[PDB]
Design a protein around this ligand. Structure first.
Ligand code: PRO
Ligand code: PRO
Ligand code: PRO
Ligand code: FES
Ligand code: FES
Ligand code: FES
Ligand SMILES: [Fe+3]
Ligand SMILES: [Fe+3]
Ligand SMILES: [Fe+3]
Lengths: 397, 397, 397
């Protein structure tokens, strides 16, 4: 059975056939046609605040380095030397004056131009051997990249998202904490888990203290109560109402938290006393933003959280959670690290356990597609539809 | 060279060509056509004595759960939730009231029927979404399963084995100890090792104190001495003489132990003072039973041992040894755990070393089939013939 | 794109396309057509000085045992028993009277003849079941093997090398130390690294104290200064001038060390006070010998170092470094182990880091061939040309 035959018979109401989650064949297609073609969230721009600052990441098999250039522009490159291919930057982050290959010291400017290569002979043309650029955009303080030479339209998303994101002043953030975990499930299982709260009541004690179980929230006609919330926010100058992409790739909405909760903490109170941004009112709740295939995000009045989803193998996925706070917020004074991070550290661990257990069952040859809950899993169906449509379009002529 | 060409040129007197032991291709065929098609030993029924008791196991890629239902019947199911596929039972063993999926709490009765699924809509038909059954038989206190929807005949074996097994009263056993090891060799190498004692004199000091080296015993015209033993047993009402399957799949015989030994212990005396069963006389020896591809067994007058062979990868096999004693036998009083288990713990470790060393040599491209000993390895040839015949029949039309 | 199409478009001046370094497909071809076909360095003959002495090694998937036979000849065999295939010698080295299989004790003479096999029946012909020989040569105290039944010409190399190697009296050596490391890069990356010192100034502080950076040395018209060195050696009876194989497989030359250095030590002085061989004058420097694909070597006046390169996987290579000293040199008296070994232990660790970092960059799909330095990497181009030519010839008719 070919991939085309499986896609042909797929019904929207059901989980995917086994090979979509387990096969090296589909994994290769997901990299080739999804991760290597779409815009992806990389890191917050505040990680590149300093002169000569760089950060590195892997995307599938690609090695990327993002750097703050002399002119203050942030640029991304393939972290592969044009001589014999070596990584140039080995550390996760650092600062340099130039990009100097550790092997034979070919030396590049922070805009990628090759400025020195030792003893290469008279016929060497350094202009042919600069670092290969990676397409890059700045979404209001969040850096996105695209590995394709012909990137899709990012501007439609950027323009829609700006009014929602600008009130968070993310350019003025710092990273308070980063957590990187490997979940032993296919990247699609990580997404299907994220896009519903059908599992939340039984699995997430800590999160449920602040995050509502209502399908309207975690998932996808606006209820009167929800509309009232949007109106409180927007009367105060804080954009809140739904935005959903035409093709389903992204969504934004600012949702209410549980009864009286203001933040993702065990006591429901703000984690940080010096807020990141100018969000009002104080109970504006959580700005939810997803953008497939790389990221979901929760921006609160006091701090923000970004999540980055990267594929590792057919049955492994890396999830990176970053806590953003105001750059002038002081650990031990304006926030406590445990208080700030404990809810989502626990939640992520619970999701990982669930995803791994789901993956273990799916590996049985007895596993067959089952029906999603229309009421509780509309967001899961929405994701699976986006994925299948994306794959179909990429495989077409 | 195709699998069919290799099977075509195979001669009975020789070990198999390399790919049978090392190739992912043959490993996939062995799962598809052998392990996924034949009856397999799972666990003793005494593991499921209690109300709501369950046990889990993996067979190749299948995840199975065996449960004692309300009506007292033991049943097996695919341990994959009909919603999104999750394992339902994660522990090796336990007790439940219902089978409740840890993900979104779909809840099944112990007969597999789906009795509650939250918010699935008006068009949801729970009768289509019960757990998928796994075929199951009870061989006189030992649970066997078959992953095929069209299982082979088990009744012929069951009827032949009953008179031999019933005298052991296995329904009245408890598990005194279980040992699970991974041997780094193909499952067929584990079997070829088991089916001869050509290696025993040099490799098994402890076992040789009680287990005879005679090829007649470990392996396949009955000698006068052996016939005399069968007659002592059968005069006392204990079935002992050879039973061999028409197609070679299974064999039973009650064999004498070494000079004066009564059990598999370092001193040769019974391990347990309260015997499991009604075997007579006290020196009735060891009831040997194999059933390919999953199990060999030694049932003694005082206790019994079951062995389960499960494939892990082309060059890895899991062997599970279970010691059964009378349910009323008390550790520290009627038996000592070290005394009961030390002989076969050592023996299994020695076999593992031998199998791994054999596998290491076989991985050389210089390895070629060699001749089995007609006198010392007739049982190995018998196994290899059963395997090749089974594969041929499965590949045919 | 087929292997043939990649080979067709290859230009000499450039590093190889990705799959040559990363693909399982090319790895299989490199084993089949290079490692399994050419002469390979195994071990120094002094490891087999004693009666009944043996040593074992793996080459790709082959398991080899080399043994000193009763008649004093050194012979090699496939370390796979002719019965059911088991390794016979499990230890890295040892002494035996006979080669006795640990499984069922088939017993072979040290010339490989099967002299005892238990209970094999009347129709068993032991003359058909001796150990399979491996072709073997002794290069003046260094043992080389070839896994092909039709080995290439070794004599041309042997005759050229003898005058250079005989002055080292390697038959009179002992092994002072052996270091075995795994480098996480393709075997070709290990070679490309070895065949240039373009990386040395920045990466090898310790080695640079004694080993010149001059491209003439580490790499490939002889300079006046170098000729003067050759002449000092040869006037003293020590062969030194270049020898390069017609087909590029091997090279020998005795090169000067840095200003006043005599040996590879932190202080530049001889590591061992009792010299291995009769090399003169004392500042004769380092005899460099490579022989693709298995070995590079440095023979100094006081001690010698051999290096053996063996493939482990597409992105892993085992490098074994052996320090040879005079058999009568006493550790703690004539040499200090740290002083003798520290320079190359550090150097090998630095090379490993470089190779692994190079491999990591090459794994990016953005990696493309880049140009080698004509002045600094002529030896790298020479190796890559030898490799590609070897592969082309093996794939031809
Ligand atoms: O491992 C390294 O050195 C860089 C960091 C991100 C992945 N590649
Ligand atoms: O790992 C688990 O949770 C179950 C137990 C047997 C194999 N699958
Ligand atoms: O592992 C062993 O026992 C032998 C030693 C070299 C490789 N094979
Ligand atoms: S690989 Fe970067 S300078 Fe050589
Ligand atoms: S996967 Fe079992 S209830 Fe959802
Ligand atoms: S495998 Fe060597 S004697 Fe049997
Ligand atoms: Fe969750
Ligand atoms: Fe054994
Ligand atoms: Fe080096």
């Amino acid at each position: 059975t070919s991939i085309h035959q499986r896609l042909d018979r797929r019904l929207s109401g059901f989980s995917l056939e086994q090979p979509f989650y387990t096969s090296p064949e589909v994994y290769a297609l997901d990299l080739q046609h999804i991760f290597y073609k779409q815009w992806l969230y990389a890191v917050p721009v505040c990680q590149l605040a300093k002169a000569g600052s760089y950060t590195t990441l892997r995307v599938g098999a690609y090695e990327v380095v993002i750097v703050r250039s002399r002119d203050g522009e942030v640029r991304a490159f393939h972290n592969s030397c044009r001589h014999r291919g070596s990584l140039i930057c080995k550390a996760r982050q650092g600062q340099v004056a130039k990009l100097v290959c550790p092997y034979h010291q070919w030396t590049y400017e922070l805009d990628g131009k090759l400025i020195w290569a030792n003893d290469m002979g008279p016929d060497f043309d350094a202009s042919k051997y600069g670092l290969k650029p990676v397409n890059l955009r700045n979404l209001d303080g969040l850096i996105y990249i695209c590995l394709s030479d012909t990137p899709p339209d990012f501007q439609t998303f950027a323009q829609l998202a700006r009014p929602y994101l600008e009130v968070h002043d993310l350019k003025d953030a710092k990273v308070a904490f980063t957590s990187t975990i490997i979940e032993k499930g296919n990247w699609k299982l990580v997404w299907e888990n994220n896009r519903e709260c059908y599992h939340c009541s039984s699995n997430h004690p800590a999160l449920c203290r602040s995050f509502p179980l209502d399908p309207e929230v975690a998932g996808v006609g606006v209820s009167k109560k929800l509309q009232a919330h949007f109106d409180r926010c927007e009367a105060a100058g804080t954009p809140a109402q739904f935005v959903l992409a035409g093709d389903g790739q992204y969504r934004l909405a600012r949702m209410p938290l549980q009864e009286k909760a203001l933040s993702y903490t065990m006591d429901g109170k703000a984690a940080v006393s010096r807020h990141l941004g100018r969000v009002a009112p104080p109970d504006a709740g959580t700005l939810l933003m997803f953008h497939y295939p790389s990221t979901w995000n929760h921006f609160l009045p006091d701090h923000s959280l970004t999540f980055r989803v990267m594929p590792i193998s057919p049955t492994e996925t890396e999830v990176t959670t970053t806590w953003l706070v105001h750059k002038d917020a002081v650990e031990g004074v304006d926030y406590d690290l445990k208080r700030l991070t404990e809810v989502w550290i626990a939640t992520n661990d619970e999701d990982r356990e669930i995803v791994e257990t789901n993956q273990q069952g799916i590996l049985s040859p007895a596993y067959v597609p089952g029906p999603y809950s229309p009421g509780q899993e509309s967001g899961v169906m929405q994701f699976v539809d986006w994925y299948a449509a994306s794959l179909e379009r990429a495989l077409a002529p």
